[PDB]
């Protein structure tokens, strides 16, 4: 709140961040509460990060990746399809642009929008093959909250990647309209369509 002067001049905009850790420098993690219960403690907010790059060990334990911040899990699912393996700096730039584009649209907080999209597009019922081979059946099961969060990020990023492929629209924007459509609930988004398909098969295969 008050300027402190150092021999190396620290800019005002980065000196403001002392009072509150935001994302890159803008988005506050407050008022990003997960409306859909059963996904709290599997959608990780309430520990702000300045940037979606935290070289964390979320793979040693089973449920440890639930504590990874949901934006970083979004970035990790972005840097995908072979030619992009690694390249988290690229994925962090895409996510920074994506969140700006979301706030340029839909003036509401882009962290909230991505959280809504995650909650809205995680399938709640799925199927599983029973029987050794094609001559078998499909039996419906319920989906754990961790798998719902996992599959939500998978469907959202896979749809954004396929939309951005072979067209003028960049990956940051295709991800932005994919998140905005999934946040509202529109069925014009890839993730909502696939989730609706998965639940439809599950109810037909109960």
């Amino acid at each position: 709140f008050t300027p402190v002067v150092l021999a190396t001049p620290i800019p005002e905009e980065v000196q403001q961040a002392q009072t509150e850790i935001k994302l890159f420098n803008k988005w506050s993690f407050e008022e990003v509460e997960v409306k859909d219960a059963s996904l709290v403690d599997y959608v990780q907010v309430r520990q702000p990060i300045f940037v979606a790059h935290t070289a964390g060990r979320y793979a040693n334990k089973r449920f440890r990746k639930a504590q990874c911040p949901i934006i970083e899990r979004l970035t990790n699912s972005l840097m995908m399809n072979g030619r992009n393996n690694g390249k988290k700096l690229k994925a962090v730039r895409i996510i920074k642009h994506t969140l700006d584009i979301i706030n340029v649209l839909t003036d509401q907080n882009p962290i909230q929008v991505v959280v809504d999209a995650i909650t809205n597009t995680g399938p709640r019922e799925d199927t599983t093959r029973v029987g050794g081979g094609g001559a078998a059946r499909r039996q419906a099961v319920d989906v754990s909250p961790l798998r719902r969060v996992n599959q939500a990020i998978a469907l959202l990023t896979i749809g954004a990647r396929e939309a951005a492929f072979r067209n003028i629209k960049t990956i940051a924007e295709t991800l932005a309209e994919e998140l905005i459509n999934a946040a509202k609930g529109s069925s014009t988004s890839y993730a909502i369509k696939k989730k609706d398909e998965l639940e439809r098969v599950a109810k037909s295969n109960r």
């Binding site: 909250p145 798998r147 109810k203």
Partner: protein, 63 residues
């Protein structure tokens, strides 16, 4: 469509031909003391809140 919310008390075990399902016992958050056993596909543990499209169905694939 009125989906219902339940909380996992116990993780019974692993069912399915390939073990990809987990049997759990759940209690209803709304109208508690209502306890059923469900099949779950993803990684699950105790206290997990799980959303069921329909409530009246007992898990049939055991052992």
């Amino acid at each position: 469509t009125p989906v219902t919310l339940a909380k996992v008390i116990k993780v019974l075990g692993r069912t399915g031909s390939r073990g990809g399902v987990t049997q759990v016992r759940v209690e209803f958050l709304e109208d508690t003391s209502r306890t059923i056993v469900r099949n779950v596909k993803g990684p699950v543990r105790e206290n997990d809140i799980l959303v069921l499209m329909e409530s009246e169905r007992e898990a049939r694939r055991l052992r």
